[PDB]
Structures are given as C-alpha cells and as structure tokens.
Amino acid sequence: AKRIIAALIVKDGRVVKGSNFENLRDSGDPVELGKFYSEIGIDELSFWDITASVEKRKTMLELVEKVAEQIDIPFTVGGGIHDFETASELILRGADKVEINTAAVENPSLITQIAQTFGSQAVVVYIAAKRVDGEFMVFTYSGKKNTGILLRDWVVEVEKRGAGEIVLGSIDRLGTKSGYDTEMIRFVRPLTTLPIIAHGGAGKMEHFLEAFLAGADAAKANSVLHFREIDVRELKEYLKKHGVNVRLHHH
Ligand SMILES: N#Cc1cc([N+](=O)[O-])ccc1O
To answer: For residue 163, what are the domain limits?
Structure first.
C-alpha cells in the first residue's frame, strides 16, 4: 500500500506562497486547502511551520486544533519541535504525528521519549541527506550543518530508538523538479523495516512511480500540487494504472 502526502509550509496560519485552487474561498488558508486535498484523494497531510518564535507555539497549537476539526485523514506537524513537551502539546491538541530532525540528531533519546507516551507510530523522523565525498551524510539546521554522521548509521539508530516512520529528504534533489532521489531511497530500503516517505525533487507523475519502485512507502510533495502542476486524482489514477497499490471512535 502506498500513500500520497501533501506537504504545506505554513507561517502565521497562512500557506506560504498559497495555491492555484480558484475554487477555494481562500487559496492561502491551510485548513481549507488541507480539507480540499482530503476530499480529492490525498492520503495524509504534513504541516511545516516557520512562524517566528514569539507566536510560534500558540500559532502551531491553533493550527492543529483547527485542522483536526475539519479533516479526517492523518496529519503530521513539524517545524522547530525540539523537546517532549512541545511534541506532546501538539499531539494532544490534535496532531496524529510529529516530525522531528535536528533535536533528534542532537538527542536521539527524544525519539524514545515521545514514543514511550504516544507510541512509535506518532514519531516521524525527517532525515535530510546529501552526498559528501561519495558518502550519504546527515544534515541538520535546515540543511546548514553537515553532522558528519553517515546516513546508514543514523537510519539504523533511528529505528532502534523507536521511530515509527522516516521522511527521507534529498538535499541533492530538493526544489529541482528533476525527480525523487531513487538511488538514496534504494540505499536506505534494506537498512530499515520502517515506512519510508520520499521527499525532494517531485516534478511529474512518473517521479512518484519511480520512487515507489525504489521502495518508498509514501511520497511527499509541495508546490507541484499547490500550483497544480500535478493533479491529485490524475496522479492516483496513473499510479493505479501501472500497478501501484494506491487507495482511491475511541473514548
Ligand atoms: N513537513 C515538512 C517539511 C519538512 C522539511 N524539513 O524538515 O527540512 C522541509 C520541507 C517540508 O515540507
């Protein structure tokens, strides 16, 4: 089974750079846009917040509460989640999963701490990687720091610490529309039993097929969806056509 995940970069409760969906009352409203995606076949949403520190905590909690009210598919929230209490408030307020990267690399036990209370399934570790001198290396602080840690080693440790999913982000392909980094995905696939979410490089429908052939369990994309370079229901139809298994109350 494969998942298509829409990623929305948000700031001050707005979708950064908005969208091309003229049928929407507000093409820059993350809740309405997310709601719409859920109705046309997106399997999950992922929100990445870049609000300034002062209002950030409150803005992210308001976001997840509003989203959880209106949508029924799973969603992830991320962006500067650095400790357990921040992760916890967001999950309790409505998010299904939290995404972490830098804070996990600096304190791998953070993975375990969140999973202890909320289950491994609530913990998504984003791994940003790039080729450096012929090796896949792990990068932190939004791609600014080469940690010197090998991708191979961090993937294995991440599963060991109890993460539920890995987002595998190729800095080599980010923003290029040249396609997902399938060599990187194939490199990581045999190292872990966790679901792998491909991120970085999506430009056309065929890129998604290639990513799944590489062993990804999900594929995440941003502006190619919001600017409607790819249509969600067309993409699902296309994937199904070529043999990809795509899909189309607790007290
Ligand atoms: N969600 C998300 C997301 C995360 C990162 N990131 O953790 O570098 C980048 C782009 C994104 O859309």
So the answer is: 1-251
Resolution in A: 1.9
How far apart CA 38 and CA 29 sit, in angstroms, is 14
Residue whose CA is closest, atom 1 of ligand 1? 48
φ/ψ of 13, rounded to 5, equals 75, 10
Joined together, the tokens standing for residue 48 give 């990445």
Cα 196 to Cα 246: distance, rounded to the nearest angstrom: 15
Question: How far is the C-alpha of 127 from the C-alpha of 218, rounded, in Å?
Answer: 15
Q: How was this structure determined?
A: X-ray
Ligand 1 pocket test, pick from 3, 5, 9, 172 with the greatest ligand atom count within 8 Å of Cβ, gives 9
Cβ neighbour number for residue 144 with a 10 Å cutoff: 9
**Where does residue 2 rank: exposed (0-12), middle (13-18), buried (19+ CB within 10 A)?**
buried
Residue nearest to atom 5 of ligand 1 (CA): 48
Residues 71, 35: Cα–Cα separation, whole Å: 6
Beta bridge partners of 200: none
Tokens of 136: 């896949």
Under the phi-then-psi rule, with left for phi > 0, alpha for psi from -120 to 50, and beta for the rest, what region is 211?
alpha
Q: Which CATH number is 92's domain given?
A: 3.20.20.70
Task: Show the tokens assigned to 120.
Answer: 């491994």
The whole-angstrom separation of Cα 192 and Cα 171 is 20
Task: Tell me how far the alpha carbon of residue 249 lies from the centroid of ligand 1, in angstroms.
Answer: 30
Residues with CB under 6 A from ligand 1: 7, 9, 46, 48, 78, 99, 101, 126, 128, 142, 169, 222
Q: What angle do CA 64, 70, 74 make, to 5 degrees?
A: 65
Domains contained in the chain, number? 1
